[PDB]
Design a protein around this motif. Structure first.
Motif, PDB file in Angstrom:
ATOM      1  N   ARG A 119      25.876   3.936 -31.513  1.00  0.00           N
ATOM      2  CA  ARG A 119      26.945   4.664 -30.838  1.00  0.00           C
ATOM      3  C   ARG A 119      26.488   6.073 -30.387  1.00  0.00           C
ATOM      4  O   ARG A 119      27.021   6.577 -29.408  1.00  0.00           O
ATOM      5  CB  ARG A 119      28.159   4.781 -31.764  1.00  0.00           C
ATOM      6  CG  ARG A 119      29.450   5.079 -31.057  1.00  0.00           C
ATOM      7  CD  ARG A 119      30.662   4.652 -31.846  1.00  0.00           C
ATOM      8  NE  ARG A 119      30.757   3.193 -31.958  1.00  0.00           N
ATOM      9  CZ  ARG A 119      31.807   2.528 -32.429  1.00  0.00           C
ATOM     10  NH1 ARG A 119      32.899   3.183 -32.826  1.00  0.00           N
ATOM     11  NH2 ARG A 119      31.779   1.207 -32.508  1.00  0.00           N
ATOM     12  N   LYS A 120      25.520   6.708 -31.092  1.00  0.00           N
ATOM     13  CA  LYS A 120      25.027   8.049 -30.717  1.00  0.00           C
ATOM     14  C   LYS A 120      24.199   8.023 -29.422  1.00  0.00           C
ATOM     15  O   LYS A 120      24.183   9.029 -28.711  1.00  0.00           O
ATOM     16  CB  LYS A 120      24.193   8.684 -31.834  1.00  0.00           C
ATOM     17  CG  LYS A 120      24.959   8.942 -33.115  1.00  0.00           C
ATOM     18  CD  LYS A 120      24.152   9.803 -34.065  1.00  0.00           C
ATOM     19  CE  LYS A 120      24.714   9.858 -35.465  1.00  0.00           C
ATOM     20  NZ  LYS A 120      24.038   8.898 -36.382  1.00  0.00           N
ATOM     21  N   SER A 121      23.523   6.891 -29.105  1.00  0.00           N
ATOM     22  CA  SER A 121      22.725   6.776 -27.877  1.00  0.00           C
ATOM     23  C   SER A 121      23.614   6.741 -26.616  1.00  0.00           C
ATOM     24  O   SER A 121      23.152   7.113 -25.532  1.00  0.00           O
ATOM     25  CB  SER A 121      21.836   5.542 -27.934  1.00  0.00           C
ATOM     26  OG  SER A 121      21.158   5.492 -29.182  1.00  0.00           O
ATOM     27  N   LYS A 122      24.882   6.314 -26.754  1.00  0.00           N
ATOM     28  CA  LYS A 122      25.879   6.289 -25.681  1.00  0.00           C
ATOM     29  C   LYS A 122      25.463   5.435 -24.443  1.00  0.00           C
ATOM     30  O   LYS A 122      25.792   5.782 -23.311  1.00  0.00           O
ATOM     31  CB  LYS A 122      26.254   7.730 -25.274  1.00  0.00           C
ATOM     32  CG  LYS A 122      26.916   8.506 -26.424  1.00  0.00           C
ATOM     33  CD  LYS A 122      28.285   9.051 -26.059  1.00  0.00           C
ATOM     34  CE  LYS A 122      29.045   9.562 -27.253  1.00  0.00           C
ATOM     35  NZ  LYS A 122      30.156  10.467 -26.843  1.00  0.00           N
ATOM     36  N   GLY A 123      24.853   4.277 -24.694  1.00  0.00           N
ATOM     37  CA  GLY A 123      24.467   3.338 -23.647  1.00  0.00           C
ATOM     38  C   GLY A 123      23.177   3.677 -22.939  1.00  0.00           C
ATOM     39  O   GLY A 123      23.029   3.366 -21.755  1.00  0.00           O
ATOM     40  N   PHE A 418      29.395  -3.757 -29.472  1.00  0.00           N
ATOM     41  CA  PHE A 418      28.642  -3.494 -28.251  1.00  0.00           C
ATOM     42  C   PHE A 418      28.424  -4.719 -27.384  1.00  0.00           C
ATOM     43  O   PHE A 418      28.348  -5.843 -27.871  1.00  0.00           O
ATOM     44  CB  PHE A 418      27.257  -2.933 -28.603  1.00  0.00           C
ATOM     45  CG  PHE A 418      27.293  -1.647 -29.403  1.00  0.00           C
ATOM     46  CD1 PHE A 418      27.516  -0.426 -28.777  1.00  0.00           C
ATOM     47  CD2 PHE A 418      27.154  -1.664 -30.784  1.00  0.00           C
ATOM     48  CE1 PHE A 418      27.628   0.744 -29.519  1.00  0.00           C
ATOM     49  CE2 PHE A 418      27.242  -0.491 -31.520  1.00  0.00           C
ATOM     50  CZ  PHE A 418      27.484   0.705 -30.884  1.00  0.00           C
ATOM     51  N   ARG A 448      20.351  -1.659 -23.408  1.00  0.00           N
ATOM     52  CA  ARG A 448      21.481  -0.756 -23.588  1.00  0.00           C
ATOM     53  C   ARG A 448      22.515  -1.407 -24.493  1.00  0.00           C
ATOM     54  O   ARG A 448      22.837  -2.557 -24.282  1.00  0.00           O
ATOM     55  CB  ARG A 448      22.178  -0.424 -22.260  1.00  0.00           C
ATOM     56  CG  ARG A 448      21.303   0.078 -21.163  1.00  0.00           C
ATOM     57  CD  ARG A 448      22.179   0.424 -19.981  1.00  0.00           C
ATOM     58  NE  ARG A 448      21.376   0.761 -18.820  1.00  0.00           N
ATOM     59  CZ  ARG A 448      20.747   1.919 -18.634  1.00  0.00           C
ATOM     60  NH1 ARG A 448      20.838   2.891 -19.545  1.00  0.00           N
ATOM     61  NH2 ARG A 448      20.021   2.118 -17.539  1.00  0.00           N
ATOM     62  N   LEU A 450      26.337  -1.009 -25.074  1.00  0.00           N
ATOM     63  CA  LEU A 450      27.503  -0.415 -24.428  1.00  0.00           C
ATOM     64  C   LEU A 450      28.746  -0.595 -25.289  1.00  0.00           C
ATOM     65  O   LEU A 450      29.262  -1.713 -25.390  1.00  0.00           O
ATOM     66  CB  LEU A 450      27.711  -1.048 -23.028  1.00  0.00           C
ATOM     67  CG  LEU A 450      26.462  -1.167 -22.135  1.00  0.00           C
ATOM     68  CD1 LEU A 450      26.780  -1.855 -20.821  1.00  0.00           C
ATOM     69  CD2 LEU A 450      25.841   0.185 -21.880  1.00  0.00           C
ATOM     70  N   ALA A 451      29.236   0.510 -25.899  1.00  0.00           N
ATOM     71  CA  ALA A 451      30.439   0.511 -26.745  1.00  0.00           C
ATOM     72  C   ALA A 451      31.607  -0.147 -26.025  1.00  0.00           C
ATOM     73  O   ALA A 451      31.739   0.045 -24.817  1.00  0.00           O
ATOM     74  CB  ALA A 451      30.809   1.940 -27.124  1.00  0.00           C
TER      75      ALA A 451
END
Ligand code: HEM
Ligand SMILES: Clc1ccc(-c2cnc[nH]2)cc1
Length: 452
Positions: A119-123, A418, A448, A450-451
């Motif tokens: 979640r910290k990488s934000k996609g 994700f 990637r 993706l949340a």
């Protein structure tokens, strides 16, 4: 008598000028191969592996050598031990890892940390190799050391780099040549020296952890494998015949990291490459997660029995993955009778697991990703005798249960939170391994998370 059929060897080269599955169509399902100055019996096909490992289980319960790591292990530790040593360690290991739902709670916890980190990488594009080595190393750290490490810890990361460098060096051409002639190449520089140095440096860290555990030991509240082993070590202190000594403690702990990380991590790496190549499959796993688990609570091991499609996809990932294609070498404990041939005592045996995972008797489309291979007419999970990625018999993978729980909880916990994307379109995704050998590895890729 005589050994199984095969190509006629040469003085020192053996069958070098004739280089397993290649020789099968001329000689048969069971054949003799000379890897220089040593004979090996190869078992190809489900039925010949099942005949040896299951029907003559005690006879085929021996363990052979991997020349590049034998100078480290020297027949100690749960993986490479034989005879009474092996029986005592394996019995103790199954019992202690079973005594500590807790392996499931720790895997759940490790999956909640992974989600938090992704979640910290934000996609952003990333190579998941390092994070999948980290979550599988953290399940063993938790089991053997009684704690986990933070993903950005430089102590943890320095040990992983050095360790995963060893797996790459082991499954390489340089090391494959070493196996054929290690009695001569041991005297020159090579990957065997680097493998030796990297595993000695991990043994030094294990040795420090063991002395720190002993120094802080509460005998009425053991917290991990090392603590339990130290209590068994003080109990058997009087007996010189006991196998529970320091050399078996260091090399048993090393064995759990050596076996319990690379293969599971790669299975997860390979699985996410297949989920990139087949989004309709990933979409269907997410649909099934949404119906059984939903989007609020995290996955639990009880959910798998109600998720046969997801469970079938994971079987198909391990099957098509085929991470240990020739198995871990075996040996016969006595002079055995096998299909009319005589295999002398201490002869090495190779259960070629790949030939069972691709057996056209049990798999409709052996070389194609087909989750239907494990689904019946009612959509229920079915298993067949071709599915043996953890081998079988008395040497069957000691961490089968751990490995299978990790794959379920990490695949579903990631996919519940994700969706995945890559710069490579599905039709142009390739699944060619990067380095074959004792442990298969796919090519590095970008992905990637993706949340949702
Ligand atoms: C997907 C992941 C995994 C796969 C495909 C796999 C596969 C295998 C295979 C093919 C063998 C050889 C068995 C034989 O000699 O016939 C084996 C042995 C072994 N495995 Fe695994 N394994 C996995 C994960 C793990 C984990 C997570 C652990 C530890 C927690 C572990 C611990 C061991 C040990 C100690 C042995 C040696 C057993 C013995 O010689 O008695 N493995 N595994
Ligand atoms: Cl040489 C060798 C020995 C053991 C393994 C293993 C056991 N379980 C998973 N990986 C791999 C390679």
């Amino acid at each position: 008598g005589k050994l199984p059929p095969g190509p006629s060897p040469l003085p020192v080269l053996g069958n070098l000028l004739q280089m397993f599955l290649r020789l099968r169509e001329k000689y048969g399902d069971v054949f003799t191969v000379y890897l220089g100055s040593r004979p090996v019996v190869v078992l190809c096909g489900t039925d010949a592996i099942r005949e040896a490992l299951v029907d003559q289980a005690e006879a085929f319960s021996g363990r052979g050598k991997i020349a590049v790591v034998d100078p480290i292990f020297q027949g100690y530790g749960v993986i490479f031990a034989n005879g009474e040593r092996w029986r005592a360690l394996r019995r103790f290991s199954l019992a202690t890892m079973r005594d500590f739902r807790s392996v499931e709670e720790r895997i759940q916890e490790e999956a909640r940390c992974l989600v938090e980190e992704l979640r910290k990488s934000k996609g952003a594009l990333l190579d998941n190799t390092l994070l999948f080595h980290s979550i599988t190393s953290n399940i063993i750290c938790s089991i053997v050391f009684g704690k986990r490490f933070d993903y950005k810890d430089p102590v943890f990361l320095r040990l992983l780099d050095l360790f995963f460098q060893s797996f790459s060096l082991i499954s390489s051409f340089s090391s494959q040549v070493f196996e054929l002639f290690p009695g001569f190449l041991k005297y020159f520089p090579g990957t065997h020296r680097q493998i030796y140095r990297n595993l000695q440096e991990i043994n030094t860290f294990i040795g420090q952890s063991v002395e720190k555990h002993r120094a802080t030991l509460d005998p009425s509240n053991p917290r991990d494998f090392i603590d339990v082993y130290l209590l068994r070590m003080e109990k058997d202190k009087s007996d010189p015949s006991s196998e529970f000594h320091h050399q078996n403690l260091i090399l048993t702990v090393l064995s759990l990291f050596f076996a319990g990380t690379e293969t599971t991590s790669t299975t997860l790496r390979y699985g996410f490459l297949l989920m990139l190549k087949y989004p309709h499959v990933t979409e269907r796993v997410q649909k099934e997660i949404e119906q059984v688990i939903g989007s609020h609570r995290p996955p639990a091991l009880d959910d798998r029995a109600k998720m046969p499609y997801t469970d079938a996809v994971i079987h198909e990932i391990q099957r098509l993955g085929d991470l240990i294609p020739f198995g871990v070498p075996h040996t016969v404990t006595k002079d055995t009778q096998f299909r009319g041939y005589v295999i002398p005592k201490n002869t090495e045996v190779f259960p070629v697991l790949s030939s069972a995972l691709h057996d056209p008797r049990y798999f409709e489309t052996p070389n194609t990703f087909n989750p239907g291979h494990f689904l019946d007419a009612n959509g229920a999970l079915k298993r067949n005798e071709g599915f043996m990625p953890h081998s079988l018999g008395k040497r069957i993978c000691l961490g089968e249960g751990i490995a299978r729980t990790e794959l379920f909880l990490f695949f579903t916990t990631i996919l519940q939170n994700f969706s995945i994307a890559s710069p490579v379109p599905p039709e142009d995704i390739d699944l060619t391994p990067r380095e074959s050998g004792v442990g298969n590895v796919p090519p590095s890729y970008q992905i990637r998370f993706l949340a949702r």
